[PDB]
């Protein structure tokens, strides 16, 4: 088993087909495209993921090739250690990984990255969240009062 | 009148600082909701360690096998909140005090939680009221 993908910037990564099957989009376009005899193993183009993010995603899927998937359960703080060590990147890389996991339809990576972002949001006042995420406070002192008025029951 | 009972052991330093920590409402992982007849659902906060160090029943109730979420709520019935408060005060300070008409309830709570020292103390007190 072998599949050769091409990134949006022009780099080619050849990986296992069973590893790429974790991506629902990749395996779906593979089943639709190359179900019959392969045409000299043509490259698969991914125009929405560059090279470094694709390499990170390949690393994550390689480490997570034995996970058994059983959809709608309770939320905790599991986030396995290797996923944390892999997600010790800057904000740009994390957002690009989020975009790739939504694009490649990788539910595990999406869950882990969304939980990382939510932990980044947890335990911070709006003034701290706006600084950690670079978001301008478009609330006037009136609306900023109305919103917290409507949510007094917490 | 009023009866009292004080005990001295090896936790003379740990019990006091744990009691100060309890009074500070800081690190706590046990929440007791005591209810008795028409009394209010009194809510106490305490450490599992201090409660387990003085009563085997608390230790058995705290070994549920999984304490990931830290804070645990344990609803308690059949005992008046004042009796449970005096029991917790003994567990934290190794000293308890009671009125001459509340000795029976304190003894009932202590027997229910197998606290031998205050059980013997309340037995002596009930004998002396004759």
């Amino acid at each position: 088993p072998s599949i050769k993908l091409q990134s949006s910037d022009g780099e080619i990564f050849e990986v296992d087909v069973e590893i790429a099957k974790q991506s629902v989009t990749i395996k779906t376009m593979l089943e639709d495209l190359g179900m019959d005899d392969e045409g000299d193993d043509d490259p698969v183009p991914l125009p929405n993921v560059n090279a470094a993010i694709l390499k990170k995603v390949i690393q994550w899927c390689t480490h997570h090739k034995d996970d058994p998937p059983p959809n709608k359960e309770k939320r905790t703080d599991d986030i396995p250690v290797w996923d944390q060590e892999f997600l010790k990147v800057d904000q740009g890389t994390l957002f690009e990984l989020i975009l790739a996991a939504n694009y490649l339809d990788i539910k595990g990576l999406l869950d882990v990255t969304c939980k990382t972002v939510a932990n980044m949001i947890k335990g911070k006042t709006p003034e701290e969240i706006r600084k950690t995420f670079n978001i301008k406070n478009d609330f006037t002192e009136e609306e900023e009062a109305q919103v917290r008025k409507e949510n007094q029951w917490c | 009148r009023t009866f009292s009972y004080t005990l001295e052991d090896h936790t003379k330093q740990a019990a006091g600082i744990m009691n100060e920590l309890r009074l500070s409402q800081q690190l706590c992982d046990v929440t007791l909701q005591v209810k008795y007849q028409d009394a209010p659902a009194a809510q106490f906060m305490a450490h599992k360690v201090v409660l387990a160090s003085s009563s085997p029943v608390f230790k058995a109730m705290f070994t549920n096998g999984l304490r990931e979420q830290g804070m645990e709520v344990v609803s308690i019935e059949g005992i008046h909140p004042k009796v449970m408060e005096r029991l917790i005060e003994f567990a934290y300070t190794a000293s308890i005090s009671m009125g001459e008409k509340c000795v029976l309830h304190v003894m009932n709570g202590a027997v229910m939680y197998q606290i031998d020292s205050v059980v013997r103390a309340c037995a002596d007190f009930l004998v002396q009221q004759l």
């Binding site: 939320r75 957002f95 999406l110 972002v117 978001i135 406070n137 917490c154 | 740990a14 058995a60 070994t63």
Partner: protein
């Protein structure tokens, strides 16, 4: 870096991982975009209304009429609302999977009747405490929510054997069951549960009026993983021996407050317990022989607790710290015949083992407090 560049679906998925407090008091006040995102009712799904300074009642009916896309409801504490809000919420949410509401001692059985009648896809039902929970309101759940998996009825003294046997007849997929201090529930409920639901993994009858006659029927459950039999009426050693022998998937065994379990029984359990991981023997009238047998014969026990065991000494802990390879937590709580300097030497010359005594746990808490010290 810009969070708002992410599609609204990703942002809603991220906000779903935030608690209601963190979402309503912080996330909704970051900007108007996050305000409009968190204000949406579509991706609410699981909602946690625990305690909430008990501040809702008519708001329950408001949010019930708002969205039907709810799969899990947590109504722990919060004694404000009555049965009518729960009834209308059940009327408005048929696709409910998990129901949780601890210590709602003002809710009667009409609420659970309406729940059973208006959401059959229930899988997890945790109704701890809550007095006035009759069996006639319980047979509704027993006959209507056949898709149940997890059930918890802790300290519900108003339950007998009729409702329990009705629950046992249906709900064949029941993987978890937990009952504590529930009198009027005896060996009949345990037997009817063990022979009708082979899917059972977690089971507990703490403080119930159960004897060995009902406990021995749990051998029909070869999928038992955790067993809780604390402060239970007269459990002889042979019954738990047969339990450990038959139930080979047994991982956690709880035998606290059983004054008749001896050290020979612990030896048999450690030998024939190839999957035993956690063993709790608080107040069990044993001796050092039990710990020595656990160390010499069991290569899988990680957590052993002999709290308040009178006859445990220094040697009983030292030999099990030397001979047990899988041991990582020792429960030496209130073993007064154990010297504390010996425990200090053990924690100094034995890594990966968290020896738990009075002074040791107090010291751990004191270090966690001295991280923010005072006097």
């Amino acid at each position: 870096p810009d969070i708002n560049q992410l599609p609204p679906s990703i942002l809603l998925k991220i906000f779903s991982n935030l608690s209601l407090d963190e979402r309503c008091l912080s996330a909704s006040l970051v900007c108007k975009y996050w305000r409009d995102l968190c204000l949406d009712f579509q991706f609410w799904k699981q909602l946690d209304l625990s305690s909430r300074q008990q501040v809702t009642d008519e708001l329950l009916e408001k949010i019930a009429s708002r969205s039907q896309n709810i799969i899990e409801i947590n109504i722990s504490d919060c004694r404000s609302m009555s049965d009518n809000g729960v009834c209308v919420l059940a009327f408005k949410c048929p696709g409910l999977l998990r129901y949780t509401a601890y210590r709602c001692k003002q809710l009667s059985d009409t609420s659970i009747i309406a729940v059973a009648s208006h959401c059959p896809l229930l899988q997890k039902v945790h109704v701890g405490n809550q007095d006035k929970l009759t069996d006639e309101g319980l047979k509704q759940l027993g006959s209507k929510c056949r898709e149940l998996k997890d059930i918890h009825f802790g300290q519900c003294y108003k339950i007998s054997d009729e409702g329990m046997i009705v629950i046992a007849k249906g709900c064949l997929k029941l993987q978890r069951i937990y009952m504590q201090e529930n009198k009027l529930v005896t060996d009949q409920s345990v037997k009817a549960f063990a022979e009708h639901c082979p899917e059972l993994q977690y089971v507990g009858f703490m403080g119930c009026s159960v004897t060995s006659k009902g406990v021995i029927h749990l051998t029909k459950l070869r999928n038992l993983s955790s067993l809780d039999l604390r402060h239970i009426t007269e459990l002889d050693n042979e019954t738990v021996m047969e339990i450990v022998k038959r139930c080979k998937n047994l991982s956690s065994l709880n035998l606290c407050l059983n004054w008749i379990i001896n050290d020979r029984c612990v030896e048999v359990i450690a030998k024939e317990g190839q999957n035993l991981k956690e063993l709790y023997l608080v107040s069990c009238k044993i001796t050092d022989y039990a710990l020595i047998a656990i160390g010499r014969y069991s290569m899988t026990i990680e957590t052993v607790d002999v709290g308040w065991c009178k006859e445990i000494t220094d040697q009983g802990a030292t030999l099990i710290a030397q001979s047990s390879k899988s041991l990582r937590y020792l429960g030496l709580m209130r073993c007064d015949k154990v010297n504390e300097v010996t425990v200090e030497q053990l924690v100094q010359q034995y890594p990966h083992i968290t020896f738990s005594t009075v002074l040791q746990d107090c010291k751990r808490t004191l270090e966690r407090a001295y991280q923010m010290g005072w006097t």
